[PDB]
Amino acid sequence: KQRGKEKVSSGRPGQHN
Amino acid sequence: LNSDGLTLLSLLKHLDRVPPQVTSTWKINASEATPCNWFGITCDDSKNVASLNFTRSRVSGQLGPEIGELKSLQILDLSTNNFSGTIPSTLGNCTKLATLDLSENGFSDKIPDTLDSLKRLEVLYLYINFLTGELPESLFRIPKLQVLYLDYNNLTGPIPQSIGDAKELVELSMYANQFSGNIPESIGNSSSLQILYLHRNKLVGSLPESLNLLGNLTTLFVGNNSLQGPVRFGSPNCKNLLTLDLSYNEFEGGVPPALGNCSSLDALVIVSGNLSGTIPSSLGMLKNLTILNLSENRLSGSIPAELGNCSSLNLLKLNDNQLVGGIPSALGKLRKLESLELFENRFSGEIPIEIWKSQSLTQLLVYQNNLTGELPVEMTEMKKLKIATLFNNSFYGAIPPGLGVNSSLEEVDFIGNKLTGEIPPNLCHGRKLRILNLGSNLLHGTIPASIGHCKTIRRFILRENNLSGLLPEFSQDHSLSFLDFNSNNFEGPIPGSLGSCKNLSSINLSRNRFTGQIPPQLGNLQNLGYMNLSRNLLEGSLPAQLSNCVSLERFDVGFNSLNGSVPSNFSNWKGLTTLVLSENRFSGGIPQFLPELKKLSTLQIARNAFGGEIPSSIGLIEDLIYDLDLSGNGLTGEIPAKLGDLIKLTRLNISNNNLTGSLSVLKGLTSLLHVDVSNNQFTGPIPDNLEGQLLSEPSSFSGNPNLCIP
Ligand SMILES: *[C@@H]1O[C@H](CO)[C@@H](O[C@@H]2O[C@H](CO)[C@@H](O)[C@H](O)[C@H]2NC(C)=O)[C@H](O)[C@H]1NC(C)=O
Ligand SMILES: *[C@@H]1O[C@H](CO)[C@@H](O)[C@H](O)[C@H]1NC(C)=O
Ligand SMILES: *[C@@H]1O[C@H](CO)[C@@H](O)[C@H](O)[C@H]1NC(C)=O
Ligand SMILES: *[C@@H]1O[C@H](CO)[C@@H](O)[C@H](O)[C@H]1NC(C)=O
Ligand SMILES: *[C@@H]1O[C@H](CO)[C@@H](O)[C@H](O)[C@H]1NC(C)=O
Asked: Quick one: which of B58, B223, B316, B538 has the fewest CB in 10 Å?
């Protein structure tokens, strides 16, 4: 086997005004 | 002995480009019986081609079908090249192939259905190609197949039912393809599977229950598919499962409580899975879970206190749900907890003091909830706090004056609460503040000089408080980007140093008490797209220097005492959408240069001293739509004919002038919804097309005795 681990979903970063 | 070498030469004829070593060592020399010292080659004990390894060379061409002549081929590594063309079904003839790596090429068309003949084949890498068509069932009948990576292709159709035949398959990667259909129940019969990447495909239907038969499972990604049905997953198997991502599907049901069984789970991520119902208590059983992301679902109920039992929890992302109740005090207990994201929910009550006491929390993102209570002095004691967005809640009391001392605040957004008291002088003590948002509170007092010192502030929003006093001076090398102070009591002159902030985009000083003159230094701001000075005590004239702000979309100075003639140099704000001069002392006649701004969709110059007449130049303004307000200028003359050119113009207020004329020209405004002509000397009848609104808003014609009826 070979490569790097696939990353999990982040979702949406928190926002500000 | 020469046979393999001759085979290598025919294959060579299919190649567009090869490394120089291939050009020099692949050739027939009457003194050489074998290819064994040739550039990409390694031979057998018996001196037959064992390995052909071209990797990370720049090789363009096709893989010719003669490759099947090498019956001793063990390794074929073509990975990371310019190969194109079809993958030959004759590869199914290399009876000794162990490793087959075609990845990172331009290979196209169908995957051969002959790979079934390869009884020794262990690893197969087809990933990152242009491959297309269905997956051959025979592909999962390759007896010894251990790892299979198909990701990043155009592959389509169903995951073959024969997948249940592959008893050696350990890692299977299908992501970023066109795969569609239901995941076959037979997937549970592929008993060794550890790593299963099904994400970013077109799959539909339910996650099959047989996924619970795979007890060696570590990593399962089904995200970005179109899946529905309940998530039936978790069981005494899944004790090996580290990672679960189901995000972006449309499930019917909630988080399965059976996930309590999977004791090793590091990350549980289902974001936007249409999950409803409650967050299960059983999640507290997971001691290794470092990530729980349930955000963007329909989740209801409270947060179980049991989650305070997830000792390794790093990220808890619950945002964009229907969650209600109080945030469990148990969560302050987690000493690894870095980011608590609760925003966009129904949470109420106070944030428990345990959470305020956390030395692990960097980011507390609670905005858009019903939260309340006072901000405790303990908040000033959270050393790792970086981002705090509490905006749109019921928080009350003063902001603790020490906030910012145990330093490193980056973002403070408290907008839209009941906060009282003054603005804390220390928010920038650590010199990291990018965002200071205190708008929409009950705050009062002046702006501390220290906050003026903070050059890292990008966004400064104080709008809608009881704040008053003078503004700070701002510096060169200030990062200010967005400034909104509207609706306060600010007084004094607009600081000229404001023009020194080269990255200033937007300025809203409106509805304040600012006096004095508009500083010419503001001509330095070439990234300014928006400027609102309206409703102040401003006086004097518009500096022509403002012609230097080439980025202006919106310019509103209305409701001040400004006087003078509108600078013609303003013909260069070529991006202006909106011009508002209304309620000032402006004179020197209505500006002629307005047509030069092709983008002008709103012109409201009402209630000034302009005098003179309505210029014919006003008639060529390409984009005039939302309003044209010339009212109240002591304008004399008749309506110039060019004005009839405005066929996009929706609203016209010409009222309260000395205009003596026909009213005839108005037949030409084809988009007019609203018009106001009043207290004018217009002679003659009313045009036809003003009826429907003439019916409803008769008042708009008054002050004109000589208007007649049809
Ligand atoms: C589904 O697709 C979305 C959108 O591309 C992915 O969202 C990203 O995930 C990465 C790594 O976690 C984040 O750092 C990026 O910010 C996101 N990219 C975009 C463009 O939004 C999501 O990860 C995908 N989920 C799965 C399992 O495939
Ligand atoms: C091909 O050669 C490269 C570089 O020597 C090597 O790292 C790689 O493992 C080889 N491929 C196989 C399958 O042995
Ligand atoms: C484990 O799985 C079983 C069977 O699916 C389920 O009934 C049970 O509630 C689960 N146990 C826990 C603690 O999650
Ligand atoms: C949030 O707060 C702001 C400022 O008070 C308010 O004007 C806005 O309408 C609020 N938004 C919601 C969704 O309540
Ligand atoms: C300037 O501010 C007022 C409110 O203070 C607002 O009504 C107006 O729309 C703003 N002007 C522009 C052009 O955005």
From this structure: B58
CA distances from B530 to B284, B406, B525 (A): 50, 36, 11
- Method of determination used here: X-ray
What b/e readout covers B195-207, taking b as 16+ CB neighbours within 10 angstroms? bbbbbbbebbebb
Mutate to test the pocket of ligand 4, among B367, B370, B371, B392 (most ligand atoms within 8 A of CB): B392
Q: Is B57 in the pocket of ligand 2 (CB under 6 A)?
A: no
Residue written as token pair 């969650």: B323
Is-contact B409 B434, C-beta < 8 A? no
Nearest by Cα to B562 from B594, B579, B587 = B587
Return d(Cα B197, Cα B221) in angstroms, integer.
5
Q: How far is the CA of B5 from the centre of ligand 2 (A)?
A: 21
The residue to which tokens 């993102």 are assigned:
B365
Ligand 4 within 6 A of CB of B440: yes
Residue B682 near residue B656 (C-beta atoms within 8 A): no
Residue B230 CA to residue B182 CA, distance in Å, equals: 14
Q: Which of B352, B333, B434 is nearest to B389 (CA)?
A: B434
Phi and psi dihedrals of B492, rounded to 5?
90, 180
CA atoms within 13 Å, Cβ hemisphere of B286: 30
**Residues comprising chain A, all counted:** 17
Q: Per the structure block, which two tokens stand in for B581?
A: 């001069």
The size of chain B, in residues, is 710
CA–CA–CA angle B532, B537, B543 (5° rounding): 60
Name the residue among B269, B363, B413 with its Cβ closest to that of A17.
Answer: B413
Fill in the amino acid letter for B517.
Q
Q: Which residue of A has its CA nearest to B247?
A: A9
| Cα gap B480→B482, rounded to integer Å | 6
Q: What would the two tokens of residue B516 be?
A: 């004095």
Closest residue of B to A3, CA-based? B149
- Burial class of residue B522, CB neighbours in 10 A (0-12, 13-18, 19+): buried
